[PDB]
A paper describes a structure:
The enzymes selected from the TDR database as small and tractable for expression and crystallization included: phosphoglycerate mutase II (hereafter referred to as PGM), nucleotide diphosphate kinase (NDK), ribulose phosphate 3-epimerase ([name]), ribose-5-phosphate isomerase (RPI), and ornithine aminotransferase (OAT).
TgRPE adopts an aldolase-type TIM-barrel α/β fold resembling homologous RPEs. Helices α1 and α2, and the β2–α2 and η1– α1 loops of TgRPE comprise the dimer interface with 4 salt bridges, 8 hydrogen-bonded and 130 van der Waals contacts (e.g., between chains A and C). A Zn2+ (e.g., ZN 303/A) ion was modeled per each chain of TgRPE, with His37, Asp39, His71, Asp182 and a water molecule coordinating the metal. In addition, the presence of SO42- in the active site induces the β6–α5 loop to move from its presumed apo conformation in the absence of ligand, as seen in the human [name] homolog, to holo conformation in the ligand bound state. Additional experiments are needed to confirm the biological importance of zinc in the TgRPE-based catalysis.
Residue numbers in the entry:
A (entry chain A): 4 to 228
B (entry chain C): 4 to 230
The structure:
Amino acid sequence: QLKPIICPSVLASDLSSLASDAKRMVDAGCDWLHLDIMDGHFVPNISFGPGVVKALRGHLKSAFFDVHLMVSEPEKWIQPFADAGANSITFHWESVGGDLQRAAELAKRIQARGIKAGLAIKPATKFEDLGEALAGDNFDMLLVMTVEPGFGGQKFMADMLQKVRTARSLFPKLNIQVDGGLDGETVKPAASAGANVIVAGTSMFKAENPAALMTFMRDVIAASD
Amino acid sequence: QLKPIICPSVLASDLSSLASDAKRMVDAGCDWLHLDIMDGHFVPNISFGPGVVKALRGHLKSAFFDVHLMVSEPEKWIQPFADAGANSITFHWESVGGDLQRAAELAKRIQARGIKAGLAIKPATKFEDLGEALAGDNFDMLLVMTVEPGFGGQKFMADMLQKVRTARSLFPKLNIQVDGGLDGETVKPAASAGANVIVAGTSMFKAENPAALMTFMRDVIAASDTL
Ligand SMILES: [Cl-]
Ligand SMILES: [Cl-]
Ligand SMILES: [Cl-]
Ligand SMILES: [Zn+2]
Ligand SMILES: [Zn+2]
């Protein structure tokens, strides 16, 4: 069955002391570490690349690395992030031109490496635009952006939860992640809509006790399912 | 007067502990911290962006930040890096269409921010193209790549030093930087050729005593009659 999975986004931490901040999250009991990769083209900012991820792996050998590719050409980054230690790689439907064969193929390329494959969609991208992209275990996870990607600290877009609901109805066993404006409040409607994987940035690094907050989030997800 | 300037390249540090490693280099007496910004389009790698640089600035108030933009659209990154605390910004001739007027305008814009402006060239680009650009007094530095940009640890391309020699003859007072494969051995031909600003990555972060390596490098530059 679906597991509750909480993933602090490191982009929200002290970017010059990533290992220390990631270790805090790991010690506070996070499930995954969400690593946003931005190339300055697909979104207007540049975050960090494979070198940062690889360096983190060196310090956190058992942590689960969830790599989110907000880049123009995801195919070019599979091998570098696989070698850096990614356990899951998510790419955007819009990065592969909404091309079903390009997407299905990239997912298998990721899976061949023993890495989970996720497919992401931006707010303006309608869930129906995916067609059968999520059919037949093409993907291990769907990421529904709940804010415009590329920036942290934005306000949760509840209207995006309809995509989650629809996805959950069709794929009862599929991991569905939400990313953007998740905190102790917004996790409720998100879980209710069917999301079981939560990316939390600003709320998690600002939290008084990150552990309690992650526990609360899991509890909310477990209660919805 | 030309000074020897050594700039450890943080791309070669423990990127997950940047503040800590950059602080080591500062304590070892580095002149500048060289920050390679790669967007995965202009070069086949992504390094880090303004957020990382800004975070580093918060920890190192007085360090000189030398930002090297290996990006497709440098015009869009000038203010973000000025805000992040850059003391110098270098952009590529190839990023501005090898266009003289574009390069000049971008440099003037960097300078208006009270920031030093640098112009960089990839190995395949012939130095002749940059002639007038550097004479225009819009640039504070020339960066000659001595490896194909994108990654650390590559082999120094000695043939690239001809560009350094030509540049040094024409512009005796211009800071000339080299980047790619600089170490205790390669710094000698580089300094003889006229480079006074040295970016060192792998060699610097592997050094048992980086303070001494940096000092050795300044000694080499001083002895080269570059100054
Ligand atoms: Cl573009
Ligand atoms: Cl590949
Ligand atoms: Cl010295
Ligand atoms: Zn993300
Ligand atoms: Zn550089």
